[PDB]
Structure formats: structure tokens, C-alpha cells
Amino acid sequence: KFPRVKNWELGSITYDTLCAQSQQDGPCTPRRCLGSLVLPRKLQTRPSPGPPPAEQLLSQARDFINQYYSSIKRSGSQAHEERLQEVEAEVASTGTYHLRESELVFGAKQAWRNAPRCVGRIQWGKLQVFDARDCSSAQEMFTYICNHIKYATNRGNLRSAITVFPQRAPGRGDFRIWNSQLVRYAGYRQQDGSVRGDPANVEITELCIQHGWTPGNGRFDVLPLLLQAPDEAPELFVLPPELVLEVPLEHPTLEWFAALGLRWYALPAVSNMLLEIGGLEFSAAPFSGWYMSTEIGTRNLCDPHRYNILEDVAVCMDLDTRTTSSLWKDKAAVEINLAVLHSFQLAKVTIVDHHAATVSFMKHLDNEQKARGGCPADWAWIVPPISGSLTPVFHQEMVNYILSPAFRYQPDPW
Amino acid sequence: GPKFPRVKNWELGSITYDTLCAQSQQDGPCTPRRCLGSLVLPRKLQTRPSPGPPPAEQLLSQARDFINQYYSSIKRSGSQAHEERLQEVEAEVASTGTYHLRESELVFGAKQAWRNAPRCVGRIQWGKLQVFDARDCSSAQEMFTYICNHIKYATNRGNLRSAITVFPQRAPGRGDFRIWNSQLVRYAGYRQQDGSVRGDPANVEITELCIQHGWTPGNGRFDVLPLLLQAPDEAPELFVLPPELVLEVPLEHPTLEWFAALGLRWYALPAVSNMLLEIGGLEFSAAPFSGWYMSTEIGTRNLCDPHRYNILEDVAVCMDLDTRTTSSLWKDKAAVEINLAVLHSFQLAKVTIVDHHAATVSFMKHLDNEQKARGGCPADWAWIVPPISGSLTPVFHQEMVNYILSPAFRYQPDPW
Ligand code: HEM
Ligand code: HEM
Ligand SMILES: C[C@H](O)[C@H](O)[C@H]1CNc2nc(N)[nH]c(=O)c2N1
Ligand SMILES: C[C@H](O)[C@H](O)[C@H]1CNc2nc(N)[nH]c(=O)c2N1
Ligand SMILES: CCS/C(N)=N\c1ccccc1
Ligand SMILES: CCS/C(N)=N\c1ccccc1
Ligand SMILES: [Zn+2]
């Protein structure tokens, strides 16, 4: 059936009919809901040593091709019919097929548009697509990645972009970017288990060292990239410092904040997810946009398993950390988020606060309701990590399901 | 690995498997196709009025399951007493179409219902519940007496005690016992000529129902509403709670001296009165239960929700913040001070309350307890994580499995 979706702040109601177009199962069942789980048990994306079932692939390919021609208002046209025949021909003889650049561009934008966990989707139509499918080495991957970064950064005036490397091929190894993001701060394990830097990057930091990287000893050492060409050991590449724009954090009124020596990079670029389009899989397709302040100020800096700076800022603010009821944690967190926004604005680097971002998502939901009869969204990820109910999305019911094209998680290459 | 949901805590990196979900006998709203976990009222549980007596076969199954749960809880499963109790229930349903619970069974079921509530973050307290048996109540007037006694016992002058009063169960083709109000304490919501609302917008409908039934309305922002109590097959009767029994707390701020001037306040006792308590197929349409507040309920939702008192702008203006731009984080700053005021005021008045940090930490302990005791704990992530400072609390980083277990507290249609 079609779910009734209500917004409790406004009392408005809609019905999601788009979910009926989903062809991939999620983790839930009538007996129990697993919507709060981060990763799949296996929904992932298993190996590719053998060719995907011709029937299945062809079914997905046709669907995508149909989606494409519908987007250009040329459905049923001569081109549409012949393109479909081309794909069938290629699959029947080779067990796979290839996308035309225009189809790739449309597919990438749709994958972003369909990502249920992305609150910035109102920007889905504005995405610069770099075709890197004519890449045959790790060195070439590095060149493409540097160009992506320079373009995406644009001196602080961030522009959303994605670079697409060669699709996966049967029996052959994948092109892969080992790092989870193009910019990551090192996490060094020492002495008594503690960690200097970012605890989230301990494993990747160690891998780089093992592969020849001369480690530093700071809290914010930008890591090198481990790029891997098919069936070859990954190679190490150091990003030119002038390409990695960073923002020193300072507070608008608290003079001592800057003394904390905190900072964060301007460009958020995901590099470990897989882009699936019409059955084809792109194991290396880094995409980037701009940060929403809470990602840095709340999660990256305040998570207990991350930089965990909450108590330090609290002590500097001379707050009463003796008890939970003083809400010192809440107070410290707000100022940290403020410092991030202030600093990025001062540095003239694009960023959006959680209020503005959620307000735009609500508009996006409305645009999509009229455009496709619904919009897949993951409530737990859409609602900000702080001030949840202070934002409109908290009061908005959502329907979560999987549509394709899609960005999916994939196994670590090591 | 194990054929059950793998649950992970991303803060500690620890893993568990939920085997308790295998015990669920009722389906939720989700399917492999789409997750509806964020819906407030998906139409499943929803105990819609089912007048004509229920299928004896249906009731019996639920009844046997509950009796098994009961005997299992006292470690006498498979015993003579167990088999005899089962026989009695089957015989009673066989001749009357329904059955009745022993005193100790009602106490066990009520506690289990709380224990099974996926949306309650205060379940670490589940074992300590005062169960008032009111299954002898036969009039709206007597319901009021029982309710007043509940309020007095539960309030205990500020040192709140969890409690539940159970009125007669639904009977074959007979009228239900019902408390029309959603809570025992509710502030009136008066629709204004210009279309706005004075008081609590959440209670507009009930406020009007009270007026329609003879209540003389006030014009304040915090007027305690009267109760509309309904005995079987009778029109609801209006009852005014004696002021001395409704403990309220004026709100003031620890450092911001002007906050007290705002004239804000909230009642001490959170008592849910419109939910249905289901035990072994038996349905208790009127069984008000109460505990104590978690500060965010008052400070964040009730006082700052756009559709509630909506005081964010007022307080922000008082703090002299830049309310003209989102990036000043004025909403966040005001909400924090409003929450601090709630905690400070309740502490000053010596009325029980728990902040969202302490409450969530205790819930984590509860999850650990339940993992060992039952192999899991059904939890609604969206309701467990607090409305403010979500990731600053431990529950945010804890994956959760949601499912329906009985005994349980379910939503039921409004009697009007
Ligand atoms: C234009 C600015 C954008 C903003 C402000 C934005 C913001 C967000 C936020 C806050 C998250 C969660 C991040 C986290 O908690 O780690 C998210 C997730 C996501 N976004 Fe966006 N986004 C933007 C651009 C993009 C772009 C350009 C793409 C791809 C073309 C994209 C794809 C996704 C995906 C796939 C996820 C989920 C990742 C996961 O499952 O871990 N976003 N976005
Ligand atoms: C001892 C103190 C307790 C605390 C701090 C606590 C806290 C909470 C909170 C924060 C909520 C969410 C309320 C909302 O958002 O409107 C909740 C939900 C719930 N609690 Fe507890 N609780 C406690 C006692 C009780 C008791 C005594 C019972 C029953 C015997 C109970 C049954 C429930 C139920 C059924 C819900 C969900 C109601 C719904 O779906 O609307 N709680 N609790
Ligand atoms: C366990 C829980 O699913 C997990 O902590 C989720 C919650 N919501 C989130 N939301 C966003 N945007 N990003 C995250 O990493 C998470 N983590
Ligand atoms: C739409 C969404 O389900 C709704 O706003 C929920 C979210 N989480 C909640 N959590 C609690 N504790 N209480 C609520 O009323 C809600 N409302
Ligand atoms: C695509 C960068 S858009 C962004 N603001 N952040 C993300 C960080 C990690 C994963 C996904 C999104
Ligand atoms: C049983 C009061 S326990 C409590 N703090 N709040 C609730 C408010 C509304 C519904 C359920 C719980
Ligand atoms: Zn679900």
C-alpha cells in the first residue's frame, strides 16, 4: 500500500507513491524494524569475479535507459528504441555494457537525488561530472583527483562535483580509493591506547605508514592517498598542501578558543562508496559538496570516539562539569558549532548551518512530492545531531527505501 | 554468524545480537520494501474499537501466552499450578467468552507492559511500579476518587513515585471505561478570534470538549483542565481537580534573573490517561500511569515546539540574540537556557526530574541489563534520542531494534 506521511508541526499530509518503484529490499520486516542500523548485513555489494546474470543486468539496464529518455522528454523516440537495442546487443555478447557520457551524468545526479541520508539534496541538479573512465593507472587517478579538488574547492567557493573512474569488470580487480574521504587527518595510536589526531582514521593511517608514508606527530596531519589500479598493490600519493584548503577555528567572542589550535578542512569528499547506475558498478567515484556545520562542530569535534573536545572547551568556559544537570555539554557544543560557522564565514569558505540546511530540505521534499510522488529519506540521518526538534525535519514523518541509480557501501579493499 | 539482528554501538565498538525479537507475535509497519519507523501512528497496533466479542480462539492463544509468561516469571513453568491456571482460563473463556486476571498477574502484566514500551527511555525503573487495582470501580465519580488518590500517591509532595491505576477491562458488547483527557494534568488551549491560541495548542480539542460539557473556561495561559471521566454506557462526567493536588513549578533561571518574570511554569506529574493496556488479550481501556519528567519533555518540546507554547523567539529576544539569521544559533542558545531553567526550577522546588544526559546513561545500563535478562530490548531510536543535543548522549551512537511485545501499552481511538 501507499503510506500516509504526516508533518506534525503543520498538520499537512501526503502519500508516498514513489516507494512503489523500489526494487531493492532494505533491512526491515514486519516482525522488526532495523532502520537505526548504520550498515547492511549484506546489502553491500559482493565480489565481481563473474559476470552478473544477463537477465538481471539487462532488466536494470533497460530500466535506467527508460529513466534517461524520460528525463529528456524523448521517451519512445527513435533514439530511445535504438539505444535499448544497443545495450541488449552488448550484454548478450559481452555480458556487460557501457554508458554514454550524457547517461552517466544523468545517472550520477539521480544517485545523489535518491540518497535517503542526504539532507542537502535540494542541490541535486547542480553537480559537475568528471568522466574519468579513460584512466588506466593509479598515477592517472591521482591526476584526476587533484583536478577534482582544485575545481571543487574553487578558493573557498565550493562547487559540488564527482569524478567517475572505470566501472567494475568481471574477474578483474576494481579501481579503488582506499581512503574514506579525499581529506583525512591522521590518527596515531601510542602508549596507553590513546590516539593523537582523528580516532576514526587509525586503520587507514596505519595502512599508509605500512606502505611507505613517513608519519607526522600532530593532531591534524593531512593523510596521503592510497590509490589502487586493478589487481595492483595500492600506491601512495601526497596531496600538494596548496590544494587542501583548511580553516583555523576561532570563536566570535571567546578570545581563548583560537588557542585550542583546532582546525578542519573545507572540502568533504567521499571516496569509498560505490556508484551503481543501470546495473553497472563504479567502485571508485569520489563525490563532494560542502559541509553542514554540525558535521564538524558536533560529530567530528565532539563525538566521544572522535576529537572529543567537549570537556576541554567546557573547562575553558569555566562551566560546572561536576554534574550532567548543568548542561555544560550542551553549552560547550553550541559554542563549538558557533566557532565553526564563524570561522568558515570569516575564511570565506562555503558552509551551511543545520537550520538553513533542514529548511531547504523541507522545500526539497515538497519539490519531490510534486515531481515524483515522494522522496526516500532516513529520519535518523536527516535530523541534526544537536537541536533536533528545533529544526523542521524533526516533525516530518519520512519513508525510507532504496531507489536506483544509487550510492551504496562496499567492502574495504584490504 | 547468529541468525538474529546484529546490533552495534559505534562509540564503544561493542556488538550484541537481538534474540528477543523472535518473541514478537505482532507485526509492525515496516517491510523489506520500505521503512516506516519514523511514523508516529502507523496503523497497526492501533487498538481500534472492536465491539462484538473477540474470537475465542484468538483470545485463548494470547491468554495462554501471557499465563506462560507469568509462570515463567515466577519460575514455575510446566508445574501443576501452571497447568491448572491454564485450564481455568480456557474454561472461563469457554463459558463467558472472556476471563479475568489474578491480582499478581495484573501486577506482572502492568510492569511487563512498561518494560516492553519501545519509546520509553526511563525503563530502567520498570521493576518499581505501584500498581493500584481499581477493577471494582463502578462509576465516573468513583473513577475520580481513584484518580485523585493516584495523583496524591504519585506526587508525594515532590518525591514522585511511578504508579498505575487499573480500571475494569473492556467487556462483551458493553461500554468502555474511559478518561477522555490525554493526561491527568493538561493546560487549556483557547482558540482566539484572530485564529491564534492562548495556552497549550495541543489541547484545543479537549478544552473545547470540556466547555461543550459544561466547564466554565478561563482565559489564562496555564489553566489546568477538568477531567472528562466516562463509565460504561454513560455520557462523560466533568470533574475539577482540587488545586492542592496538582503540583506545579514556577520556572526561573539560575543566572538570568528576568526569566522568572516570564511567568512560565509546568506541572510536576506526567500521567498518561488515553492509552490502552493490553494483557493476555484482555483490554484495559482506562488505566492511567505516571512516572516523572525528563527535562527535555518540558524545556524543549512542550515549551519550544512551533506548535506548542513556541517561546524560543521570546526568550532569544530577552537574551538579546540575533533572531534575524539562522547562523547565530539563537534557537540553540535559547533552548539550552530554557532547559536549564526547567532543571533548575524543579531542583529548587524539590520535585523529581531527570536531565537527558542522566536519563540516557541510565537507559544504556538498562539495555545491558535486558541483553542478559532477555536477549535484547525493543527500542524506537527516534523516540529514545532526546530532542536536543542528540549525539552528545550515548543512545545516539547505539543501534536499536524495534518490535512489538505483549503485554503492551497501545494507542486507542478517541471515545468521541
Ligand atoms: C551541496 C552540499 C551538500 C550538503 C550540505 C550535504 C550534507 C549531507 C550530510 C549532513 C550528510 C551526512 C554526513 C555524515 O553524517 O557523515 C550527507 C550524506 C550523504 N550525502 Fe550529502 N550533502 C551535500 C552534497 C552531496 C553530494 C554532492 C553528494 C553526491 C553527489 C552527496 C551524497 C550523499 C550521500 C550518498 C550521503 C550518505 C552517505 C552515507 O551513507 O554515509 N551529498 N549529506
Ligand atoms: C520513571 C520515569 C520515567 C521517565 C523519565 C520516562 C520518560 C519517557 C519519555 C521521555 C518518553 C517520551 C514522551 C514524549 O515524547 O511525549 C516516554 C514514553 C513512554 N513511557 Fe516512559 N518514562 C518514565 C515512566 C513511565 C511509566 C511509569 C510508564 C508506564 C508504566 C511509562 C510508559 C511509557 C510509554 C508507553 C511511552 C510511549 C508513549 C507514546 O507512544 O506516546 N513511562 N517515557
Ligand atoms: C546508531 C545510529 O544509527 C548512528 O549513530 C547514526 C544516527 N544518525 C546519523 N546521522 C548522520 N547524519 N550521520 C551519522 O553518522 C549518523 N549516525
Ligand atoms: C515525525 C517524528 O516521528 C516525530 O516528530 C517524533 C520524533 N521523535 C519523538 N521522540 C519523542 N520522545 N517524542 C515525540 O513526540 C517524538 N516525535
Ligand atoms: C559528499 C560530501 S557532502 C557532506 N556535507 N558531507 C558528507 C560527509 C561524509 C559522507 C557523506 C557526506
Ligand atoms: C508515564 C509518564 S513518564 C514521562 N516522563 N512522560 C511521558 C509523557 C507522555 C507520554 C508518555 C510518557
Ligand atoms: Zn523500519
mmCIF file with all atom_site columns, C-alpha atoms in Angstrom, chain A residues 86-171:
data_model
loop_
_atom_site.group_PDB
_atom_site.id
_atom_site.type_symbol
_atom_site.label_atom_id
_atom_site.label_alt_id
_atom_site.label_comp_id
_atom_site.label_asym_id
_atom_site.label_entity_id
_atom_site.label_seq_id
_atom_site.pdbx_PDB_ins_code
_atom_site.Cartn_x
_atom_site.Cartn_y
_atom_site.Cartn_z
_atom_site.occupancy
_atom_site.B_iso_or_equiv
_atom_site.pdbx_formal_charge
_atom_site.auth_seq_id
_atom_site.auth_comp_id
_atom_site.auth_asym_id
_atom_site.auth_atom_id
_atom_site.pdbx_PDB_model_num
ATOM 1  C CA . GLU A 1 86  ? 22.423 -1.314  -28.374 1.00 0.00 ? 86  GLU A CA 1
ATOM 2  C CA . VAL A 1 87  ? 22.501 -2.237  -24.692 1.00 0.00 ? 87  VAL A CA 1
ATOM 3  C CA . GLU A 1 88  ? 20.801 -5.578  -25.331 1.00 0.00 ? 88  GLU A CA 1
ATOM 4  C CA . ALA A 1 89  ? 23.294 -6.361  -28.076 1.00 0.00 ? 89  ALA A CA 1
ATOM 5  C CA . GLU A 1 90  ? 26.299 -5.543  -25.898 1.00 0.00 ? 90  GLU A CA 1
ATOM 6  C CA . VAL A 1 91  ? 25.051 -7.534  -22.910 1.00 0.00 ? 91  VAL A CA 1
ATOM 7  C CA . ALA A 1 92  ? 24.138 -10.618 -24.944 1.00 0.00 ? 92  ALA A CA 1
ATOM 8  C CA . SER A 1 93  ? 27.600 -10.793 -26.494 1.00 0.00 ? 93  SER A CA 1
ATOM 9  C CA . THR A 1 94  ? 29.904 -9.449  -23.760 1.00 0.00 ? 94  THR A CA 1
ATOM 10 C CA . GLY A 1 95  ? 27.883 -9.914  -20.571 1.00 0.00 ? 95  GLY A CA 1
ATOM 11 C CA . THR A 1 96  ? 28.034 -6.196  -19.845 1.00 0.00 ? 96  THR A CA 1
ATOM 12 C CA . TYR A 1 97  ? 27.666 -2.780  -21.469 1.00 0.00 ? 97  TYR A CA 1
ATOM 13 C CA . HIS A 1 98  ? 28.798 0.828   -21.254 1.00 0.00 ? 98  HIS A CA 1
ATOM 14 C CA . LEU A 1 99  ? 27.133 4.155   -20.575 1.00 0.00 ? 99  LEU A CA 1
ATOM 15 C CA . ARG A 1 100 ? 27.342 7.203   -22.797 1.00 0.00 ? 100 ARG A CA 1
ATOM 16 C CA . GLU A 1 101 ? 28.688 10.304  -21.047 1.00 0.00 ? 101 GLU A CA 1
ATOM 17 C CA . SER A 1 102 ? 25.295 12.043  -21.038 1.00 0.00 ? 102 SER A CA 1
ATOM 18 C CA . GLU A 1 103 ? 23.695 8.977   -19.438 1.00 0.00 ? 103 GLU A CA 1
ATOM 19 C CA . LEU A 1 104 ? 26.488 8.850   -16.853 1.00 0.00 ? 104 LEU A CA 1
ATOM 20 C CA . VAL A 1 105 ? 25.871 12.500  -15.950 1.00 0.00 ? 105 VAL A CA 1
ATOM 21 C CA . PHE A 1 106 ? 22.140 11.902  -15.534 1.00 0.00 ? 106 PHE A CA 1
ATOM 22 C CA . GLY A 1 107 ? 22.798 8.738   -13.547 1.00 0.00 ? 107 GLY A CA 1
ATOM 23 C CA . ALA A 1 108 ? 25.155 10.451  -11.118 1.00 0.00 ? 108 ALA A CA 1
ATOM 24 C CA . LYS A 1 109 ? 22.688 13.257  -10.390 1.00 0.00 ? 109 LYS A CA 1
ATOM 25 C CA . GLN A 1 110 ? 19.914 10.696  -9.795  1.00 0.00 ? 110 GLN A CA 1
ATOM 26 C CA . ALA A 1 111 ? 22.072 8.694   -7.367  1.00 0.00 ? 111 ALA A CA 1
ATOM 27 C CA . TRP A 1 112 ? 22.528 11.830  -5.271  1.00 0.00 ? 112 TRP A CA 1
ATOM 28 C CA . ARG A 1 113 ? 18.836 12.648  -5.624  1.00 0.00 ? 113 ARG A CA 1
ATOM 29 C CA . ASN A 1 114 ? 17.980 9.150   -4.358  1.00 0.00 ? 114 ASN A CA 1
ATOM 30 C CA . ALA A 1 115 ? 20.354 9.093   -1.345  1.00 0.00 ? 115 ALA A CA 1
ATOM 31 C CA . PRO A 1 116 ? 17.965 8.891   1.656   1.00 0.00 ? 116 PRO A CA 1
ATOM 32 C CA . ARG A 1 117 ? 20.619 10.045  4.133   1.00 0.00 ? 117 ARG A CA 1
ATOM 33 C CA . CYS A 1 118 ? 21.490 13.301  2.332   1.00 0.00 ? 118 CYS A CA 1
ATOM 34 C CA . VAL A 1 119 ? 19.885 16.489  3.703   1.00 0.00 ? 119 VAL A CA 1
ATOM 35 C CA . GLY A 1 120 ? 21.449 18.679  1.022   1.00 0.00 ? 120 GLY A CA 1
ATOM 36 C CA . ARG A 1 121 ? 19.585 17.173  -1.926  1.00 0.00 ? 121 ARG A CA 1
ATOM 37 C CA . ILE A 1 122 ? 17.915 20.427  -2.934  1.00 0.00 ? 122 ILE A CA 1
ATOM 38 C CA . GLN A 1 123 ? 21.203 20.945  -4.792  1.00 0.00 ? 123 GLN A CA 1
ATOM 39 C CA . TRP A 1 124 ? 20.962 17.593  -6.608  1.00 0.00 ? 124 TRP A CA 1
ATOM 40 C CA . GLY A 1 125 ? 20.623 19.175  -10.049 1.00 0.00 ? 125 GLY A CA 1
ATOM 41 C CA . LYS A 1 126 ? 23.856 21.145  -9.733  1.00 0.00 ? 126 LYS A CA 1
ATOM 42 C CA . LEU A 1 127 ? 26.694 18.637  -9.950  1.00 0.00 ? 127 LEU A CA 1
ATOM 43 C CA . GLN A 1 128 ? 29.843 18.879  -12.084 1.00 0.00 ? 128 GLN A CA 1
ATOM 44 C CA . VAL A 1 129 ? 30.553 15.442  -13.543 1.00 0.00 ? 129 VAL A CA 1
ATOM 45 C CA . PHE A 1 130 ? 34.117 14.468  -14.491 1.00 0.00 ? 130 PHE A CA 1
ATOM 46 C CA . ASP A 1 131 ? 34.346 11.408  -16.721 1.00 0.00 ? 131 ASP A CA 1
ATOM 47 C CA . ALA A 1 132 ? 37.500 9.598   -15.619 1.00 0.00 ? 132 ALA A CA 1
ATOM 48 C CA . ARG A 1 133 ? 36.585 6.288   -17.267 1.00 0.00 ? 133 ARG A CA 1
ATOM 49 C CA . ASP A 1 134 ? 39.606 6.537   -19.601 1.00 0.00 ? 134 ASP A CA 1
ATOM 50 C CA . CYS A 1 135 ? 42.002 6.079   -16.679 1.00 0.00 ? 135 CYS A CA 1
ATOM 51 C CA . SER A 1 136 ? 44.428 3.089   -16.594 1.00 0.00 ? 136 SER A CA 1
ATOM 52 C CA . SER A 1 137 ? 46.774 3.679   -13.655 1.00 0.00 ? 137 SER A CA 1
ATOM 53 C CA . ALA A 1 138 ? 46.972 4.880   -10.058 1.00 0.00 ? 138 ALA A CA 1
ATOM 54 C CA . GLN A 1 139 ? 49.091 7.820   -11.217 1.00 0.00 ? 139 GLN A CA 1
ATOM 55 C CA . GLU A 1 140 ? 46.299 8.911   -13.563 1.00 0.00 ? 140 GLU A CA 1
ATOM 56 C CA . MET A 1 141 ? 43.793 8.521   -10.745 1.00 0.00 ? 141 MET A CA 1
ATOM 57 C CA . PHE A 1 142 ? 45.900 10.933  -8.697  1.00 0.00 ? 142 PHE A CA 1
ATOM 58 C CA . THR A 1 143 ? 45.943 13.487  -11.504 1.00 0.00 ? 143 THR A CA 1
ATOM 59 C CA . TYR A 1 144 ? 42.155 13.274  -11.864 1.00 0.00 ? 144 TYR A CA 1
ATOM 60 C CA . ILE A 1 145 ? 41.648 13.575  -8.105  1.00 0.00 ? 145 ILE A CA 1
ATOM 61 C CA . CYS A 1 146 ? 43.830 16.685  -7.877  1.00 0.00 ? 146 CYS A CA 1
ATOM 62 C CA . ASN A 1 147 ? 41.832 18.344  -10.651 1.00 0.00 ? 147 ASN A CA 1
ATOM 63 C CA . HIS A 1 148 ? 38.600 17.397  -8.890  1.00 0.00 ? 148 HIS A CA 1
ATOM 64 C CA . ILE A 1 149 ? 39.864 19.008  -5.681  1.00 0.00 ? 149 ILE A CA 1
ATOM 65 C CA . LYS A 1 150 ? 41.044 22.249  -7.329  1.00 0.00 ? 150 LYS A CA 1
ATOM 66 C CA . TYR A 1 151 ? 37.724 22.628  -9.131  1.00 0.00 ? 151 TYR A CA 1
ATOM 67 C CA . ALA A 1 152 ? 35.569 21.639  -6.166  1.00 0.00 ? 152 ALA A CA 1
ATOM 68 C CA . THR A 1 153 ? 37.424 23.909  -3.744  1.00 0.00 ? 153 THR A CA 1
ATOM 69 C CA . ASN A 1 154 ? 37.378 26.946  -6.043  1.00 0.00 ? 154 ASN A CA 1
ATOM 70 C CA . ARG A 1 155 ? 39.253 29.070  -3.476  1.00 0.00 ? 155 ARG A CA 1
ATOM 71 C CA . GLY A 1 156 ? 36.565 28.680  -0.819  1.00 0.00 ? 156 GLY A CA 1
ATOM 72 C CA . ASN A 1 157 ? 33.595 28.983  -3.154  1.00 0.00 ? 157 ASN A CA 1
ATOM 73 C CA . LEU A 1 158 ? 32.854 25.257  -3.090  1.00 0.00 ? 158 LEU A CA 1
ATOM 74 C CA . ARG A 1 159 ? 31.165 23.584  -6.052  1.00 0.00 ? 159 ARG A CA 1
ATOM 75 C CA . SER A 1 160 ? 29.662 20.079  -5.934  1.00 0.00 ? 160 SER A CA 1
ATOM 76 C CA . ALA A 1 161 ? 31.489 17.534  -8.093  1.00 0.00 ? 161 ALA A CA 1
ATOM 77 C CA . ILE A 1 162 ? 32.020 13.860  -8.820  1.00 0.00 ? 162 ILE A CA 1
ATOM 78 C CA . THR A 1 163 ? 34.753 12.066  -10.767 1.00 0.00 ? 163 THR A CA 1
ATOM 79 C CA . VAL A 1 164 ? 33.876 8.644   -12.183 1.00 0.00 ? 164 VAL A CA 1
ATOM 80 C CA . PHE A 1 165 ? 36.644 6.062   -12.680 1.00 0.00 ? 165 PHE A CA 1
ATOM 81 C CA . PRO A 1 166 ? 36.362 2.783   -14.671 1.00 0.00 ? 166 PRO A CA 1
ATOM 82 C CA . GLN A 1 167 ? 33.405 0.553   -13.814 1.00 0.00 ? 167 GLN A CA 1
ATOM 83 C CA . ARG A 1 168 ? 33.967 -2.862  -12.269 1.00 0.00 ? 168 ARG A CA 1
ATOM 84 C CA . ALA A 1 169 ? 34.629 -5.696  -14.707 1.00 0.00 ? 169 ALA A CA 1
ATOM 85 C CA . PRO A 1 170 ? 34.113 -9.482  -14.283 1.00 0.00 ? 170 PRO A CA 1
ATOM 86 C CA . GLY A 1 171 ? 37.096 -11.424 -12.955 1.00 0.00 ? 171 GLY A CA 1
#
